[PDB]
Amino acid sequence: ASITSVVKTSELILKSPLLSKIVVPLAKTYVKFSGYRQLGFKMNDLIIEETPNMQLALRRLPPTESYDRVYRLIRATQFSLSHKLATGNDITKPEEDDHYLIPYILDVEAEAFEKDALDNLEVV
Amino acid sequence: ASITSVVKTSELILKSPLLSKIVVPLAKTYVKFSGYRQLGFKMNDLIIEETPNMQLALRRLPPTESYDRVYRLIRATQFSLSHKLATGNDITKPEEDDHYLIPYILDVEAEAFEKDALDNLEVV
Amino acid sequence: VSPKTRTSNLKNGLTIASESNPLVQTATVGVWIDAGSRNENAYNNGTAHFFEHLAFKGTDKRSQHQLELDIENMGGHLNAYTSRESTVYYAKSFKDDVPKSVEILADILQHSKLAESAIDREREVITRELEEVNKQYEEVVFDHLHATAFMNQPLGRTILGPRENIQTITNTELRKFITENYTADRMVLVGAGAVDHDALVELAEKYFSHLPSSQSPVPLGTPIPNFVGSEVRLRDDTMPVAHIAIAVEGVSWTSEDYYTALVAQAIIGNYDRAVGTSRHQGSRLSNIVSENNLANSFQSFSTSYSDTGLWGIYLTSENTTQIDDLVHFTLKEWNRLSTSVSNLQVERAKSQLKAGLLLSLDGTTYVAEDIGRQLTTLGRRVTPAEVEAKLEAVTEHDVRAWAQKTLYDKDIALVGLGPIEGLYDYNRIRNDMSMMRW
Amino acid sequence: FSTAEAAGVKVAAQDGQSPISDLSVVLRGGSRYATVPGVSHILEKFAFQNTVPKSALRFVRELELFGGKLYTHTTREHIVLRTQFLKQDLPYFVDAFANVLKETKFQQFELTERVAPVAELDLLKRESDPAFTALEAAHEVAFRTGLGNSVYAQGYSPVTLEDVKEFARQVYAKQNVAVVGNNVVPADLQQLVGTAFADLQEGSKVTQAGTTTLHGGEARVRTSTGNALTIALPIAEPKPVYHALASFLGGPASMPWSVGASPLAQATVGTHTSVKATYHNYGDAGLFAITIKGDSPAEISQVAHKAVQALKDTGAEVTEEQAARAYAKSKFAAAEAFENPDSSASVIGMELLSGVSRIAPENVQKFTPAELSEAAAQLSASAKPVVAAVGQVHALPFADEL
Amino acid sequence: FSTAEAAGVKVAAQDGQSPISDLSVVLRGGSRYATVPGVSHILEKFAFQNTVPKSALRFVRELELFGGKLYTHTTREHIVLRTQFLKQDLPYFVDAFANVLKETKFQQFELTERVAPVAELDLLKRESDPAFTALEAAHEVAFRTGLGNSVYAQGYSPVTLEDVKEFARQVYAKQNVAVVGNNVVPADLQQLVGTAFADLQEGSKVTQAGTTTLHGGEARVRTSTGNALTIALPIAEPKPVYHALASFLGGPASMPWSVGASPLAQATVGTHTSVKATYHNYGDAGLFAITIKGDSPAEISQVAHKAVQALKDTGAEVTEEQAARAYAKSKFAAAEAFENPDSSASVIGMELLSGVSRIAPENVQKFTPAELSEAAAQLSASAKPVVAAVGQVHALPFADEL
C-alpha cells in the first residue's frame, strides 16, 4: 500500500466521530504492544525504504532529521543484536514519535500519481 | 623476455663483425617472410601490451604516435577479418618501420630493473 | 486571424508576395530563390555558396565600400543564406527605407561584378571556412547525415563543396550558375511587416523587370533520391559530448503524409535538460531520458525536400556508458508509433502543433521566411485554416499506417561524433527498428 | 499599448491581427533590487514551480495541450515572465500568472533539485561567450552594488530558500507587478486581471539598497575559454545621445562576409575579432561599453587601442553624413527592440513600473554632429574608466595603457 | 661566510662545529626572470629528476643511505636547492648538484607524471592560506610583469617541456649559479666545486624582460576558503627604514594567548583576525604590505580601516621608546633570518649573484623617530595603493574606501 492510501483512509476514520471513538483507542493500544518505541524507533523509521519513491523522500529530509534517523537505526540495530531493550532516554516517548517523513513521501507520491494520471489524459 | 634483454643481445651481435655479417641478412629475410608489413603494421605494433610496463610505455607515447598506432591496429584488424592484404600506401615500407615504442619501454624497464636491484642493496 | 497574403506576378514570371502588419515599423523584403547547392554538379559544387560571398563584394555601380556605406546609411541590415534547395537574400529596414533595400537587392543579384581579384580574395576566406565548421558539431553531424543517406547523389553534397573546387571556381562558372538558376520563374520577392503590396509590385516592375525567364518554366517547388541505409562514425575520445543523429527517409513538401510525419515527430518531441519545463513533458521518451539522465538533449526533426526528406532525431549526451540505453529507448519509442499509438498521443500532438505552426511566425523575418519558403516549395501560401484542416485530418490510424511503412523495420542513416565507443554496430542499432514481441 | 489599471495592477495591452498572443508579467525584482546575490535569478527560475492550486507538472502538461510556450529572464531592472499562446486561451494564462504570484509553494526540494541546477546551467551557457563575462565584470567594477550586483546566481554565494521566500514576499505584490499583453484585446485583459489579481498583496515598492555610485577600475577574469575585453565608461547623467553614439561607433557588420563601415568595425581589419558598442540606460546612471572578443589576445590588444582612438576621433569631428547614418541606425535599433517580445515587455514595463515614457522609434531624436562629438568628448575625458579583461589576462591591455 | 671563486662559480662557505652541513645551490632563476609563467617553479620541481649519470630513483635511494634531506623552493629572485647531510658526505652532494646542472635529462614523462603534479599540489597547499593568495595577488597588481609574474605554476598557463628546457639552458650556467655551504670547510668546498662544476657552461646573466614599473589598483579573488586582505604600497626607492617600520607596525604577538603591543596588533582587539606588516626589498623596487586574515569579512573590514589609520598615526609621531622597540624587533628579525638555512642561502646568494653586500644583524641601523615617521608619511601619501581582497570579496573593502 502507498503511504497516500494509508493517510487518506486514516483521515476518513478520524473524520467520522463514531469511527474515531472506536479506532483511535485500539490504534494506541496496538502501538503500545507493537513495542517499536522500546527500541528507540519512531514509527516512520519502520517504513520500507527500498523503493524509488522512498529513496527520493529520504534524500529530501533536512540534514538534521537525516542524521538523527541514521543514529536511531544504528542504535536499534545494536539493541537488536544484543537482545536488549532501550531504557531511560532511549525509549521513544509518545510526544517524540513525530511523523517526520510522512510529508516528504506524500509529496513524492502526489507527483508520481499525478504523472500516472496525466500520462493517461484524453483530449476532449 | 624483456625488451631490454632483446635489445642488449641484438647490440652484442651488431657489434661483432662476423656475427652481424651472418645475422643481419637472415633477420631481414625473416622480417620479409613474417609478412606483418603486408597488414600495414610496424614491428613495434606487435609487442604484447598487456603488462604494467607496456601499459606505462604506451601512455608515454606522444599523442600523434598514439593516434597513428590506433589507426594501424584498426586497419590491420579490418584486413584480418576480411582476409585481405594491404596494397599500395597501406603496405609498411622498410623505411617506415620505425622503432617508435622501443625508447619508451626501455626507459620504463630501466627504472623497473633499477628498482628491483636497489630493493636488494646491502650496506657495506 | 492574420492579414491575407497578397500575391502578384510580373510578365517575366516573378512572383511578388506580401503580408502587411500595421502594428510594426520595420519591414523584411527579400528574394527567395528555388535554387541551391543541389543544382550544382560535382565539378562546380560550392558555386552557389561562393556566389553568396561575392554578391556582397561590389556591383557594376557601387564598389564594395560604396555597398557597405549604402546599407549603413539605410540603417537596417542585409542577410543571405544558401541551402541545398533554396537561396535567400533579404533586407530588414525601416518602413520608408524599403525602396532603397529593394534597389540594393536587385543590384547585387543582377549586376554583380565577380571580379577576378575578389574571387581570388574570397577563395582563401572560404578555404578557412572548411576548417572552422569542424567546431559546429550539429552542422558536422547533419552534413555527414546527408552525405551518407544520399550517398553519391546531389542531395548528399555539402554546400561549401570540396577544397579542390574552391581553388578552381572561375567567374565564368559563377556567371553561368546564376544565369541558369536565378531566373524570374524561380524567384519570389517577399515583403513582410510595414510594406504596401502595391508599392512592392511597382518596385519589382522597376528593378526586376529585366530578369531572364527560363526556357522551360516549371511550377515553383518542382524537383530520383535513393536513400542508403548506412553509418558514419567520427569517434573522438577527447570530446566530452557524443552527438548522434539517426534518420530514415522522410517525406517531401508535397507528400500526402507531410502532416502525418509532423504529428509523428511531435509525439517524440524535443528535450533539453537546461530548460526547466523539460522534465515535465508528456513525451514518453522525454520521461525515460530525463529520469535516467540519458542525454543532455534530443531534437526530433522532419526535414523535407522537393522529392524526399529525412525524418529522425538528433541526440547529445555526456553519459558515455549508457549511449546504448539512450539509442535503445529512442528506437523503442519509434517502434510504438507503429504498434501502440492511439488517439491519446495523436490528439495531444495535434493540439500542440495547431499552435506551434502559428507561434513560429512571431517577427517580420519569420513571416517573410514562411511566405518565401511556402511559395518556393508549394507554389502558394497555405492559409492557417487549410493547415488546421490538414492537421485535423490526421488520425491515430494514419500515424500507425505511416510509421509501419516508413519506420518499422527500415534502414536508418546513422552518424555518431565524439565519445561513441558505446554506440553499437549498425546491426544492433537497426535491430531496434522492430519489436520481436509484435 | 493602452496603459490602464485593474485592481491596483498596471495593465498595458495592444490589440493586433494575429492568432498569437504574448502575455508578460514584468516584476520590479531585477538584480539591482536583489537582497542577496543571485536571488533575482533564482526567483525567476522559481516561476511556474509548484503552486497550491496547480503543480509544476500539471502546468507543463496543460501548457502542451494549448501548445503554449514559457519564456523567463532576469535583467538588472526586471524579472520578465512571458507566455505565448493562441489568442482565445487568454483566461488560462492570466489565471496561471495569478497562481504563481499568490500561491507559489517554494519547497526546499524544488530549490535543490530543480531551480538551482537550472540556474547553474543557464549561467554556464551564457559564460561560454567571453564577451558576456567581460560586460558583466564591467558592471561589477563600475557600480559595485545595485547595478553592480551579479544578474545570475553563482556557486560561491549560495541562495537559500529563506532568501528567495523573503524576496518573493516583497516582489510578488501589486506595487511591483506590471502586466503587458501583445495582441491581447485591452478591455478583456483588464477584466481578467481585475478578477485574478484582486487578492494579491498590495505590498510596497521595492527599492535599491543604497544610491548608485560610480567607480573606475579593472577586472581580470582568468578563463581558458576565449578572450574578451570591455572598455566601459560609467555615465552619471544618462542622455539619449549615447544611443546614437553607440550605433554610430557600431562594430557589427550590416552585411554578410563584410567588416562594416562603422569606425569600430574598421578597427578590426586584418584581425579575426569582433567589436560592439553598447549603451545601457538604467535611469539614474548609464554605462557606455565597447566589447571586443577574439581568439588572439594580441589582436584584441591591437583593436582596443584603435577603439579608444576611434572614440577620441569622434570627439574631434563627425560629418553630417555620419550623423545621419547614426540617426538611421539608431531609429532602426529602437524599432526592432520594440518589436522583439522580450525587450518590448521590459520597455513598457519600465513605463508602467517607473514612469519613464517610452520613446517611440518614430520620435527618436536626430542628433547634430555637434551633439555627437560633444558626447564622445565627455567619454574620452572620463575620470572613471573601467576595463574588464577575460581570458589570457596577462596578455590583454590595462586601463592605464588605454 | 668566506666568499671565493672556484672555476668561475662563486662559492661562500662558513665552517662550524656541528655534524650537519647544509649545501645550497642558489640560481638566478626566480620568477622575475621567468620566460613563461610558472617556469621557474617547474624548473625547481625538476631538480634531482633523472640525470644522465644517475636516475631520480637511484639518487633518492642513496640519499636515504646518507640520511640526507633535500629542500627546494622558488622565490621571485632565486631558485634554491638545499641539501642537508653529515659533514663528511660533502663530495657526494657537490657531485649530485653538478649532475643536476650539467646533465638533467628533462623527459616529457617526468613533466607529465612527476613534476607538474607535484607543482600543482605545492600551490594548492599554499593557497589553503588566503593570506598567501592576497599577498601574491598584490604583487601581481603592483608590478604586472617581472616581480608581478606568479611565483608558482598555474593550470590556466601550461608550462611545456620546451619552455622548461630553454629556461634551464639559460639558468644552469656558471653566470647564474652560487654555491653556499653552511658548516662546510671553505677550502674543501672550493676544491670540490672547482673539479665538479668546471665543464658547466659559462652562459650569460639572466635578466628581467623589461624594467620594473609600479602600478596601483585592486585584485578581487573570489574563494570559498577563507578571507584575507592585503594593503600594499609599491616602493620606487627601497630603503632599509621600511624593515624598521614593518617591525614597528608589527601585527603578530610575541607571547602566547596575547594580542601584542604593536599598533597593528592592537587594531585586532575584539576580533578573531590576525595581521602582519611586511616589507619586501627586490633591489630596484620594494613592496610594503599589511595582510589581514580572518573568518569574518566584517571584522577584516574593521581592522583594515584601523590598519590604515595606524600607518597615518605613525606618519604623525613615534616616541623614542617606539623607535627603540622597532630597532630591537628589526635586529632580531634580521638575526633569525640569517640563521634559518632557507633564508640564509638566499641572503648570501643575493650578495654573490647580484652584489648587494649583506647587512649583518649587528650592523642593522637604528632609525630615529624622525626617520620612521617620515617613512610612514611617505606611504600614507602614496599615489599607487594596491588592495587585494580574497574570499567574500563583495564584503571586503575597496582601495577608495581606505
Swiss-Prot record, chains A, B:
Belongs to the UQCRB/QCR7 family. Component of the ubiquinol-cytochrome c oxidoreductase (cytochrome b-c1 complex, complex III, CIII), a multisubunit enzyme composed of 3 respiratory subunits cytochrome b, cytochrome c1 and Rieske protein, 2 core protein subunits, and additional low-molecular weight protein subunits. The complex exists as an obligatory dimer and forms supercomplexes (SCs) in the inner mitochondrial membrane with cytochrome c oxidase (complex IV, CIV). Component of the ubiquinol-cytochrome c oxidoreductase, a multisubunit transmembrane complex that is part of the mitochondrial electron transport chain which drives oxidative phosphorylation. This is Cytochrome b-c1 complex subunit 7. It is a peripheral membrane protein. Keywords: Electron transport, Membrane, Mitochondrion, Mitochondrion inner membrane, Respiratory chain, Transport. Coiled coil: none annotated. GO terms for cellular component: matrix side of mitochondrial inner membrane; respiratory chain complex III. It comes from the Eukaryota. One of its GO terms (molecular function) is ubiquinol-cytochrome-c reductase activity. GO terms for biological process: mitochondrial electron transport, ubiquinol to cytochrome c; mitochondrial respiratory chain complex III assembly. The keyword Mitochondrion applies. The gene is QCR7. PANTHER family: CYTOCHROME B-C1 COMPLEX SUBUNIT 7, UBIQUINOL-CYTOCHROME C REDUCTASE COMPLEX 14 KD PROTEIN. The keyword Electron transport applies. Pfam families: UCR_14kD (PF02271). Its main location: mitochondrion.
Swiss-Prot record, chains D, E:
Its main location: mitochondrion. One of its GO terms (molecular function) is metalloendopeptidase activity. One of its GO terms (cellular component) is mitochondrial crista. GO terms for biological process: mitochondrial electron transport, ubiquinol to cytochrome c; proteolysis. Keywords: Electron transport, Membrane, Mitochondrion, Mitochondrion inner membrane, Respiratory chain, Transit peptide, Transport. It is found in: Mitochondrion inner membrane. It is a peripheral membrane protein. Component of the ubiquinol-cytochrome c oxidoreductase (cytochrome b-c1 complex, complex III, CIII), a multisubunit enzyme composed of 3 respiratory subunits cytochrome b, cytochrome c1 and Rieske protein, 2 core protein subunits, and additional low-molecular weight protein subunits. The complex exists as an obligatory dimer and forms supercomplexes (SCs) in the inner mitochondrial membrane with cytochrome c oxidase (complex IV, CIV). Component of the ubiquinol-cytochrome c oxidoreductase, a multisubunit transmembrane complex that is part of the mitochondrial electron transport chain which drives oxidative phosphorylation. PANTHER family: CYTOCHROME B-C1 COMPLEX SUBUNIT 2, MITOCHONDRIAL, METALLOPROTEASE. Belongs to the peptidase M16 family. UQCRC2/QCR2 subfamily. This is Cytochrome b-c1 complex subunit 2, mitochondrial.
